[PDB]
Design an enzyme around this catalytic site. Structure first.
Site, short mmCIF file in Angstrom:
data_model
loop_
_atom_site.label_atom_id
_atom_site.label_comp_id
_atom_site.label_asym_id
_atom_site.label_seq_id
_atom_site.Cartn_x
_atom_site.Cartn_y
_atom_site.Cartn_z
N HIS A 72 0.83 -1.20 0.00
CA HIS A 72 0.00 0.00 0.00
C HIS A 72 0.87 1.26 0.00
O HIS A 72 1.91 1.29 0.65
CB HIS A 72 -0.90 0.02 1.25
CG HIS A 72 -1.89 -1.11 1.35
ND1 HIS A 72 -2.59 -1.36 2.51
CD2 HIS A 72 -2.26 -2.02 0.41
CE1 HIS A 72 -3.37 -2.40 2.25
NE2 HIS A 72 -3.19 -2.84 1.00
N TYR A 203 -6.82 4.25 10.97
CA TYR A 203 -6.60 4.38 12.40
C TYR A 203 -7.49 5.56 12.80
O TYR A 203 -7.23 6.68 12.36
CB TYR A 203 -5.14 4.74 12.67
CG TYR A 203 -4.17 3.58 12.50
CD1 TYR A 203 -3.60 3.30 11.26
CD2 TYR A 203 -3.81 2.79 13.57
CE1 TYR A 203 -2.69 2.26 11.11
CE2 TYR A 203 -2.88 1.76 13.44
CZ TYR A 203 -2.32 1.50 12.20
OH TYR A 203 -1.40 0.48 12.01
N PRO A 295 -0.06 -2.85 20.37
CA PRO A 295 -0.04 -3.15 18.92
C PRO A 295 -0.46 -2.04 17.97
O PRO A 295 -0.41 -2.21 16.74
CB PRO A 295 -0.96 -4.37 18.79
CG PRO A 295 -1.83 -4.32 19.95
CD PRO A 295 -1.03 -3.71 21.07
N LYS A 299 4.91 -3.06 15.93
CA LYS A 299 6.37 -3.17 16.06
C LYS A 299 6.85 -4.54 16.60
O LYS A 299 8.03 -4.84 16.48
CB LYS A 299 6.88 -2.08 17.03
CG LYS A 299 6.66 -0.66 16.54
CD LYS A 299 7.52 -0.37 15.35
CE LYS A 299 6.95 0.70 14.47
NZ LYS A 299 6.99 0.28 13.06
N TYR A 387 6.71 4.51 11.06
CA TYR A 387 5.74 3.46 10.75
C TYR A 387 6.37 2.30 9.97
O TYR A 387 6.13 1.14 10.33
CB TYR A 387 4.52 4.01 9.99
CG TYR A 387 3.37 3.02 9.98
CD1 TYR A 387 2.57 2.84 11.10
CD2 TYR A 387 3.10 2.25 8.85
CE1 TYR A 387 1.52 1.92 11.10
CE2 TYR A 387 2.06 1.32 8.84
CZ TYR A 387 1.28 1.15 9.97
OH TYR A 387 0.27 0.22 9.99
C1 LIG Z 1 -3.49 -7.67 18.17
C2 LIG Z 1 -2.02 -7.74 17.84
C3 LIG Z 1 -1.57 -7.30 16.61
C4 LIG Z 1 -0.20 -7.30 16.28
N1 LIG Z 1 0.17 -6.83 15.05
C5 LIG Z 1 1.45 -6.79 14.77
C6 LIG Z 1 1.88 -6.28 13.51
O1 LIG Z 1 1.10 -6.03 12.60
N2 LIG Z 1 3.23 -6.19 13.28
C7 LIG Z 1 4.14 -6.61 14.20
O2 LIG Z 1 5.33 -6.42 13.94
N3 LIG Z 1 3.77 -7.16 15.36
C8 LIG Z 1 2.50 -7.24 15.66
N4 LIG Z 1 2.09 -7.76 16.87
C9 LIG Z 1 3.08 -8.31 17.81
C10 LIG Z 1 3.66 -9.65 17.34
O3 LIG Z 1 2.64 -10.59 16.91
C11 LIG Z 1 4.52 -10.28 18.44
O4 LIG Z 1 5.43 -9.27 18.95
C12 LIG Z 1 5.32 -11.48 17.93
O5 LIG Z 1 4.47 -12.62 17.76
C13 LIG Z 1 6.46 -11.87 18.85
O6 LIG Z 1 7.17 -12.96 18.24
P1 LIG Z 1 8.04 -13.91 19.17
O7 LIG Z 1 8.64 -14.91 18.24
O8 LIG Z 1 8.94 -13.08 20.03
O9 LIG Z 1 6.93 -14.58 20.13
P2 LIG Z 1 5.65 -15.49 19.83
O10 LIG Z 1 5.06 -15.08 18.52
O11 LIG Z 1 4.76 -15.49 21.03
O12 LIG Z 1 6.29 -16.95 19.65
C14 LIG Z 1 6.79 -17.67 20.81
C15 LIG Z 1 6.51 -19.14 20.64
O13 LIG Z 1 7.01 -19.84 21.80
C16 LIG Z 1 6.17 -20.94 22.04
N5 LIG Z 1 6.35 -21.39 23.42
C17 LIG Z 1 5.72 -20.89 24.54
N6 LIG Z 1 6.01 -21.57 25.62
C18 LIG Z 1 6.82 -22.62 25.18
C19 LIG Z 1 7.44 -23.70 25.84
N7 LIG Z 1 7.28 -23.98 27.13
N8 LIG Z 1 8.20 -24.54 25.09
C20 LIG Z 1 8.31 -24.31 23.78
N9 LIG Z 1 7.78 -23.32 23.05
C21 LIG Z 1 7.03 -22.51 23.82
C22 LIG Z 1 4.77 -20.43 21.74
O14 LIG Z 1 3.86 -21.49 21.51
C23 LIG Z 1 5.03 -19.54 20.51
O15 LIG Z 1 4.81 -20.27 19.31
C24 LIG Z 1 0.73 -7.79 17.22
C25 LIG Z 1 0.27 -8.30 18.44
C26 LIG Z 1 -1.07 -8.25 18.78
C27 LIG Z 1 -1.52 -8.79 20.13
#
Ligand SMILES: Cc1cc2nc3c(=O)[nH]c(=O)nc-3n(C[C@H](O)[C@H](O)[C@H](O)COP(=O)(O)OP(=O)(O)OC[C@H]3O[C@@H](n4cnc5c(N)ncnc54)[C@H](O)[C@@H]3O)c2cc1C
Ligand SMILES: Cc1cc2nc3c(=O)[nH]c(=O)nc-3n(C[C@H](O)[C@H](O)[C@H](O)COP(=O)(O)OP(=O)(O)OC[C@H]3O[C@@H](n4cnc5c(N)ncnc54)[C@H](O)[C@@H]3O)c2cc1C
Lengths: 390, 393
Positions: A72, A203, A295, A299, A387
Site C-alpha cells: 500500500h 486508524y 499493537p 512493532k 511506521y
Molecule cells: C493484536 C495484535 C496485533 C499485532 N500486530 C502486529 C503487527 O502487525 N506487526 C508486528 O510487527 N507485530 C504485531 N504484533 C506483535 C507480534 O505478533 C509479536 O510481537 C510477535 O508474535 C512476537 O514474536 P516472538 O517470536 O517473540 O513470540 P511469539 O510469537 O509469542 O512466539 C513464541 C513461541 O514460543 C512458544 N512457546 C511458549 N512456551 C513454550 C514452551 N514452554 N516450550 C516451547 N515453546 C514454547 C509459543 O507457543 C510460541 O509459538 C501484534 C500483536 C497483537 C496482540
C-alpha cells in the site's frame, strides 16, 4: 541430543534465528509447545517494517511474501469526522506499507527450516532450562506432551518463547529490572466475512474511542474497537460491536462501513514491557520473551526480527573467532532499538486512544497533535518513517 | 473620552494591537495600571518567533530589535551528559532563534506609540468594564490612581490585561469553557553578571531536574533551574544555585559554566490555560488574558502577537467595509494556533523536566523522545518549525 544453539519457541524470533544461524553453518534445535497446525493457524497481523522485508529477502525466504503480500502507498488517520491520508510512498521517496500475515511468515520459515535439514519438535511439554550460568546449558522437554524426558545439550539457549514462556523466569529476579505500562483500555478484535471498506488501513480517533480497520484478504477483514480494560466479550453483542464501529468511523463525507458475520471476537489487553538485561550467562532472550509493545504501532514481530539479527551476529563471532564482545553487548545493542520502538508505540497509542482519565486540556492537546501531524510535511514524514521502520 | 478601540493593558498584546490599528488609521486609547518604569523593567520573555520578528519589522518598529537582538542559528538539547544541536537556520530554510527581551520590545512599542500620537494612560486605578454586550461598551478608570473617574466610550474593548486582569471575568462563566494543567514544578530564574557560557540556548534534562541557559547581553545571562512548585527563594542560596546548575549542565566533554554575581533570583510558577471563547459582544481578549503556556516553548509573547494580528485584521474589515465575519471568527482562528502552541509547550515541558511521579518506564520513554528528536532529520525539522513558530493562518 547435542547442538550449538537450543531454541525455545517457533515464533518469528526462534524461526528467524534458526535460519540465520543455518545460513552461517551454525546448528540449532527448536522446541515448540504448540502443534505446527496451531502456530501456522493464527489470525495475527502482518504489518512488516522495511527492515523485516529486507531480512526475509536477504535470507532467501521472501519469495511468497513478495508474490502474495499487499503493498500500500499509505494509511489513514481519521479524526474529527475527517480522514487524513499519510502518503508513505510519497513521504519516504518510494517505500510501501507492507502487509503479509504473521501466520504466513511462520509457514514460510517452518517450510524453509524443514527443507534445509532443520530440527523442530512440535507439541512438546514439560519444558525446563538448566545450568544457564555454565558453559553447558541444557533444555529438558517431553516430545508430544507425554513422551520420555529428553535433553538438549547446547552452548547457548535462545529464549524465543514469548511473554509467558519459561525462559524469562530463568533470568533471576535479583539481576533483572522490568519496566511496564498498563494502558487504561484494551482492544476488542473481530474477524469478519465482508469486502474491505477502504483500500488502506484506517486508524480512527473518535470522541467515543479508537477504532482500527485492517484487512486479511478481499473476503476477510480484521477490525478493532478500543474498550474499557475490564470489559468482557459477553458485554459486546454483534449489534453493539457494529453500532460502535459505525459511530466511531463516521465521517462528514459519509463513510460506508461494510459489515458481515463476526466469525471471531475477543478482547486483548494492551501493555508496554521491557526486561533489562535480555541475557544471563549462556541464556539470551529475544522478541516478546524480553519486551512487549501495544499493537497500535505494529512493532512486535519487527522487534523480534531485529533482536535475533544482533544475537545471530554475536553467535557467529563466537563460533568463527572465539570472540565474546558482541554477545556481551547483545542487551545493550537490542535495547537501543527496543526503547525507540517502545516510544513510537506509546506515541501512536496515546495519540489515537480516548483516555477517560484525560482532562479536557489533555483531550485538546491530543486533537492538536492529530491536526499537527496531518498538516506538517516534516511531522507526517517522521510518522511515515517510524511506521515503516528506521 | 471617545475612541474606536479601548485597550486594557500595555503589554506586548495591547501595544502591538494599538500600533497595528494606528498603521490602518484606527484610533485607540490604552490604559495600564502599572507605571511606564514598571512595564519597561519586566524580567520574563527572551525568545521571539520568526513571525514576531517579521511583524516588528513590517510595523516599522524593528530597528533596535535588529541592531541589539541576538540571532542564533540554533539551540541545544542536552541529555545523558551530551549536547545535541538543533540547527534551526538550516532546518527551516533561513530562520533564526531571536533573543530580544520582552522589556526591550515594550520599551520600543511604548516609544513608537507616543511618537505617533498614541494615547497611553499609565498608573491607572479603579478599572472596570461596562455594557460589553452592547454596541457602546465603556471602560471606567481613575488616572494616576487618585484622579477623577473617567470613561472611555468605544466601539470595542480589547482585553490585553494579562492572566489576572479584569477583562476575562467580563465574559460570563455561563458562556466560557476553561482548560487547564497544573505542573508539579516551577522555575527558579536568575540574572547573572557574567559572559555567556555558550553561543546558543541550552535546554538540559538531567536526573536531578531541568536547567536552561539563556542570555540577555554579553554581560548579563538568564538561567533557570526546575524546582518543586512549593519552593521559596530562601531555600536557594547562591551556592546551592551554582552547585545545582553545574550538576545538571555537566557533560562528558567537560562544559565550563561561567559564574558571576547573581543579582536577581526568583521563583515563577507555570501552567497551561485556555479560555474559549476569547470574545463576548464587543469585548475581545488577547494574549495572557485568554491563554497561558508553560515557558519551556517560549510561546506566550509570540501567541499574544499572533492573537492581535487576527484581531486587528477583523477590526480593519469592520471599519473599512462594515464586515463582521473576521471579528465573529476571531476566537475560532486564534484557537487553532493556540492549541498547537499549547501542545508544543506541553511537549517541551514534559520531555525536559524531571517528574518524580513518573514510573521507570515513563522515564525511559522521556529519554527515548530526547534521543529521537535529535537523531531524525524530519523529527528535528518538526521540532525546529514548532520552536520558531508555525506558519500564520
Ligand atoms: C493484536 C495484535 C496485533 C499485532 N500486530 C502486529 C503487527 O502487525 N506487526 C508486528 O510487527 N507485530 C504485531 N504484533 C506483535 C507480534 O505478533 C509479536 O510481537 C510477535 O508474535 C512476537 O514474536 P516472538 O517470536 O517473540 O513470540 P511469539 O510469537 O509469542 O512466539 C513464541 C513461541 O514460543 C512458544 N512457546 C511458549 N512456551 C513454550 C514452551 N514452554 N516450550 C516451547 N515453546 C514454547 C509459543 O507457543 C510460541 O509459538 C501484534 C500483536 C497483537 C496482540
Ligand atoms: C519565566 C517566563 C519566561 C517566558 N519566556 C517567554 C519567551 O521567551 N517567549 C515568549 O514568547 N513568551 C515568553 N513568556 C510568556 C510571556 O511573558 C507572556 O505570555 C506575555 O507577557 C503575555 O503578554 P500580554 O500582553 O498578553 O500580557 P502581559 O505581558 O501580562 O501584559 C498585560 C498588561 O496588563 C496590565 N494590566 C493588568 N490589569 C490591568 C488593569 N486593571 N488595568 C490596566 N492594565 C492592567 C498589566 O500591568 C500588564 O502590563 C515567558 C513567561 C515566563 C513566566
Amino acid at each position: 541430543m547435542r547442538t550449538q544453539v537450543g531454541i525455545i519457541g517457533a515464533g518469528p524470533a526462534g524461526l528467524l534465528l534458526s535460519h540465520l544461524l543455518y545460513l552461517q553453518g551454525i546448528e540449532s534445535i527448536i522446541i515448540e509447545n504448540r502443534t505446527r497446525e496451531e502456530i501456522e493457524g493464527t489470525i495475527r497481523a502482518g504489518v512488516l517494517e522495511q527492515g523485516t522485508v529486507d531480512l526475509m529477502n536477504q535470507m532467501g525466504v521472501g519469495a511468497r511474501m513478495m508474490k502474495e503480500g499487499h503493498f500500500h502507498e499509505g494509511f489513514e488517520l481519521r479524526f474529527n469526522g475527517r480522514g487524513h491520508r499519510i502518503n508513505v510512498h510519497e513521504l519516504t521517496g518510494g517505500k510501501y506499507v507492507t502487509v503479509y500475515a504473521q501466520h504466513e511468515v511462520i509457514k514460510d520459515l517452518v517450510a524453509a527450516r524443514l527443507q534445509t535439514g532443520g530440527q523442530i519438535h512440535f507439541n512438546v511439554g514439560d519444558v525446563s532450562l538448566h545450568d544457564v550460568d555454565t558453559s553447558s546449558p541444557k533444555i529438558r522437554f517431553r516430545p508430544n506432551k507425554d513422551g520420555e524426558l529428553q535433553e538438549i545439550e547446547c552452548d547457548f539457549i535462545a529464549g524465543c518463547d514469548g511473554f509467558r514462556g519459561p525462559s524469562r523466569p530463568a533470568i533471576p529476579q535479583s539481576v533483572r529490572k522490568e519496566y511496564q505500562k498498563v494502558y487504561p483500555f484494551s482492544w476488542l478484535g473481530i474477524l469478519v466475512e465482508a469486502p474491505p471498506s477502504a483500500h488502506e488501513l484506517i486508524y480512527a480517533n473518535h470522541e467515543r474511542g479508537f477504532a482500527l480497520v485492517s484487512t486479511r484478504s478481499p473476503q476477510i477483514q480484521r477490525l478493532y474497537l478500543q474498550v474499557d480494560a475490564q470489559d468482557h466479550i459477553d458485554n459486546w453483542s454483534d449489534d453493539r460491536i457494529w453500532s460502535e464501529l459505525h459511530a466511531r468511523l463516521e465521517t462528514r463525507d459519509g463513510f460506508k462501513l461494510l459489515e458481515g458475520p463476526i466469525f471471531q471476537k475477543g478482547i486483548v489487553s494492551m501493555r508496554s514491557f521491557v526486561c533489562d538485561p535480555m541475557q544471563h550467562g549462556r541464556l539470551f532472550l529475544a522478541g516478546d520473551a524480553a519486551h512487549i509493545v501495544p499493537p497500535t504501532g505494529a512493532k512486535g514481530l519487527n522487534l523480534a526480527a531485529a533482536d535475533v539479527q544482533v544475537l545471530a551476529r554475536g553467535l557467529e563471532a563466537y563460533y568463527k573467532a572465539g570472540k565474546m564482545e558482541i554477545l556481551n553487548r547483545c542487551t545493550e545493542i537490542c535495547l537501543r532499538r527496543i526503547w525507540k520502538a517502545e516510544r513510537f508505540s506509546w506515541f501512536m497509542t496515546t495519540m489515537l486512544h480516548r483516555d477517560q482519565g484525560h482532562t479536557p486540556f489533555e483531550r485538546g492537546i491530543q486533537l492538536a497533535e492529530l491536526d499537527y501531524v496531518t498538516s506538517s510535511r516534516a511531522a507526517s514524514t517522521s510518522l511515515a518513517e517510524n511506521y515503516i521502520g528506521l
